Each structure stands twice: as structure tokens, then as C-alpha cells.
């Protein structure tokens, strides 16, 4: 009966930024999802494909836990079939995709007063991402017709913006930290089930 | 816009029933999970009860369980209290007030609640 | 059965000043906070719900503020529509409770 580390997911001291973010394998462990659905905790435990009442009556093969930080009303756009500024630059889910979306405000950890600049998400991109991309590149964005010369300014664009994370703002605009749990099935022996 | 509309409130002796109704519009009914609240003449409000979108969870006050009873009929769009047993200290005006998305599939704005509420009926209790 | 203490209960101000109200929870309920008013004969109307975000429609004299135990709404200056009575309400778990609500008198 081991038991899975989502206490290192979960209750971790610090969290990426959307655009960098972390993701954490787990395997080899019983997952007591229920726990956490009726934890009177996060503010969204939503789930696509899995029925988030009995969900620990599954097993897969992987479980990833990806951990970021977002601002809340951009919590809707983490989805499948959204569309967005994190769901096309900074996090994509896939149109078939199986797992829970849980979002739990942290206006307490992730705020400082006059803004926290330790998150930051992608503005610009060429394109949009494919599911489960991670793209951590810093090169400047060429938003117009002349080469950016690795200089910003007139229509170059350094990619990625940041949070002004105030405790003093409104819901939408606080800071939400964000778990998004994806069930990896393979041709191999199912390693991560739930109590029975 | 949202609107939620109360009835069936009204004089009963002890012992008796009571069937309130809340029929909502203007929002995806069937989405958000629903509350009973109420408060006695010249005192404070009181929560009695949820119940959640799907229908499948509910949970009620102490002081109303196991008489009280809420359901909710998604197609007609409307919420009911079923309230047996009535004593006296239920003499009250009732309010039916929006909840927080809880879908199917999950919940998503645990702190948005509360939002819009009915107008309230009254229902009192005596011999 | 978490417990919200409201303080004070009764309070008398005149129009203008800053009014402070104080709600503390006996247990820890994060940012499931919401601060209602209810003028007499009336139906209770949401002021702010995330223990500290105003709700559309609220002039911003009022304000939330606090967290995990403790929280405060106050009003910068008051107005003669804002003599009525204020309830903070938790619900953050079963049972969803009210606190003891505190009515703002005038002063004379």
C-alpha cells in the first residue's frame, strides 16, 4: 500500500509559470483520488472522460501531474477545446483528453504587494501549441515585416508577460495554482490504482 | 437575466407539509448546484440546505434533517424543498439562492455562490 | 459547524464615516467568504464573495479584506443607503453558516 506523493504535487512550495510548466510522473502507487474531490479546498475539480464521484475505482498505467500558476478567470481556458492566451501560447489540452483539471487559489502564497513578478505567461507565439507542448523559449517575437535583430522595440516583442500578481486584485486577476491530472494508459502492467 | 422565483409557501399546523418551488431562468439550471435559506421573523439567516446540479448530492442544516428534503427537476428548471414534519421554529421566509457550478463532471467556481437569490415565500407554522 | 463571530452586533454611525465590521471563523475556511446586506423587508444582496472581490454592481466605498481566520468589511464613507444590516456567511464546508449579522443605526 504505497501510497502517491501527491503532497510533493500539491503541497509544493513553489509553483512554474504557466509557460515552464512542471510536470511529475507518477507510478507504482495508490492514488486515493477521492480524498482530494471532497477536499473543501480547490476552487475547480473538474474532470473529462473519468466520472471525478468513483474515479478511484480506476487504474491506469502513468498518472502526470502537471503543476503551473494562472490567473483565475484564465482557470476556464485550462479545458479541453478552449481557446485563449494559455491555451494557445503556455498550455494545451487535446480535444479526447482523460483527466481532472483542480484549481485552488493561492491569493496568500503567490502575491506581493505592488506585484510578484515570478510568473509569467506567453503573449506571442507563431503558432498555437500542440497538446501537452512546453515551449520555453525567450526569442524575441517578430510581430511585423523587418527582422527583430534579437532588439525589441517597433514590432518586437519580448514573448512573455508577467503576472502583476497584488493581493489587491479582483478574482479573476489572483492567482490560482493548478493541478492537471492525465491517466496514461499503455500496453504494460497498470501500475497507479485507486483504494480497491 | 437571472431569475428565481419562489412559491408554495403558507399556514400550516405542526406536523404538516409544505412543498416550495423555485423556478429559475436566465442560466444553465442544470449546471450549478442550489441552495435553501431561511430566516424566522426578527432574527438572522440560516442555511438549509444544497443540493448539486447532477441531483445526486445533497446535504442539509441539522436542524432540518431527515425532515426536510430537497430535490430538483432539471427539465422544468425548478428547485423544490419537500418540508415534513413542520414545527413551529420553521416559521420562516425561505429563499432559494444560486449556488456554484457543479456539473456532472465536477465543480468549478467554489467561491462564486450566492449570487442571486429569490425573492422568498413564507411559511409559518402554528396550532 | 464552523462558527462566524460578527463584531459588533449593533453599531451607530454617521453619514461619512469609516465603518469596520469584523467576522472571525472558529476554524480555517480559506477565501469561502461572502458579505451579504439586507435592508429591512428585503431579500439579501451580495456584497462581496471571495472575502475580498467586490461584486459587479457594488459602488466601491465597500471593501473585503482577511483571510483564514479573520476578515473585514468596511466601508470608507457611509451613505444614507447604507444603513441596513450586514451578514458575513461562510461556505466553505457543511454546514454553510452565518454569522450573527450587525446592524448599522444612525447616530444622532
Known amino acids: 500500500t504505497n501510497l502517491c506523493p501527491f503532497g510533493e504535487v500539491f503541497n509544493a512550495t513553489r509553483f512554474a509559470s504557466v509557460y515552464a510548466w512542471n510536470r511529475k510522473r507518477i507510478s507504482n502507487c495508490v492514488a486515493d483520488y477521492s480524498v482530494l474531490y471532497n477536499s473543501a479546498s480547490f476552487s475547480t475539480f473538474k474532470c473529462y472522460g473519468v466520472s471525478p464521484t468513483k474515479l478511484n475505482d480506476l487504474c491506469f498505467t502513468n498518472v502526470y501531474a502537471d503543476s503551473f500558476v494562472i490567473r483565475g478567470d484564465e482557470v476556464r481556458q485550462i479545458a479541453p477545446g478552449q481557446t485563449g492566451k494559455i491555451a494557445d501560447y503556455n498550455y494545451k489540452l487535446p480535444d479526447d483528453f482523460t483527466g481532472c483539471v483542480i484549481a485552488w487559489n493561492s491569493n496568500n502564497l503567490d502575491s506581493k504587494v505592488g506585484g510578484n513578478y515570478n510568473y509569467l505567461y506567453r503573449l506571442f507565439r507563431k503558432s498555437n501549441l500542440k497538446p501537452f507542448e512546453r515551449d520555453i523559449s525567450t526569442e524575441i517575437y517578430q510581430a511585423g515585416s523587418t527582422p527583430c535583430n534579437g532588439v525589441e522595440g517597433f514590432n518586437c516583442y519580448f514573448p512573455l508577460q508577467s503576472y502583476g500578481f497584488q493581493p489587491t486584485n479582483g478574482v479573476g486577476y489572483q492567482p490560482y495554482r493548478v493541478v492537471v491530472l492525465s491517466f496514461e494508459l499503455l500496453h504494460a502492467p497498470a501500475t497507479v490504482c485507486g483504494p480497491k | 437575466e437571472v431569475q428565481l422565483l419562489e412559491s408554495g409557501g403558507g399556514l400550516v399546523q405542526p406536523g404538516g407539509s409544505l412543498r416550495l418551488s423555485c423556478a429559475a431562468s436566465?442560466?444553465?439550471?442544470?449546471?450549478?448546484?442550489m441552495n435553501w435559506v431561511r430566516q424566522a421573523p426578527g432574527k438572522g439567516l440560516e442555511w438549509v440546505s444544497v443540493?448539486?446540479?447532477?441531483?445526486?448530492?445533497?446535504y442539509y442544516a441539522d436542524s432540518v434533517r431527515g425532515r426536510f428534503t430537497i430535490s430538483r427537476d432539471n427539465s422544468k428548471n425548478t428547485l423544490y424543498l419537500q418540508m415534513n414534519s413542520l414545527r413551529a421554529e420553521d416559521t420562516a421566509v425561505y429563499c432559494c439562492?444560486?449556488?456554484?457550478?457543479?456539473?456532472?463532471?465536477?465543480?468549478?467556481?467554489?467561491?462564486?455562490?450566492?449570487?442571486?437569490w429569490g425573492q422568498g415565500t413564507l411559511v409559518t407554522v402554528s396550532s | 459547524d464552523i462558527q462566524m463571530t460578527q463584531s459588533p452586533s449593533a453599531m451607530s454611525a454617521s453619514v461619512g464615516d469609516r465603518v469596520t465590521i469584523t467576522c472571525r471563523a472558529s476554524?480555517?475556511?480559506?477565501?469561502?467568504l461572502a458579505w451579504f446586506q439586507q435592508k429591512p423587508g428585503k431579500v439579501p444582496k451580495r456584497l462581496i464573495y471571495?472575502?475580498?472581490s467586490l461584486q459587479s454592481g457594488v459602488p466601491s466605498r465597500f471593501s473585503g479584506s482577511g483571510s483564514g481566520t479573520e476578515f473585514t468589511l468596511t466601508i470608507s464613507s457611509l451613505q444614507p443607503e447604507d444603513f441596513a444590516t450586514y451578514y458575513c456567511?461562510?461556505?466553505?464546508?457543511?454546514?454553510?453558516?452565518f454569522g450573527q449579522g450587525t446592524k448599522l443605526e444612525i447616530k444622532r
Open positions: 439562492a444560486k449556488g456554484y457550478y457543479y456539473d456532472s463532471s465536477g465543480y468549478y467556481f467554489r467561491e462564486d455562490a450566492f449570487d442571486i
Open positions: 471571495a472575502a475580498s
Open positions: 443540493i448539486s446540479g447532477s441531483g445526486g448530492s445533497t
Open positions: 456567511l461562510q461556505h466553505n464546508s457543511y454546514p454553510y453558516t
Open positions: 436566465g442560466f444553465t439550471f442544470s449546471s450549478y448546484a
Open positions: 476554524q480555517g475556511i480559506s477565501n469561502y
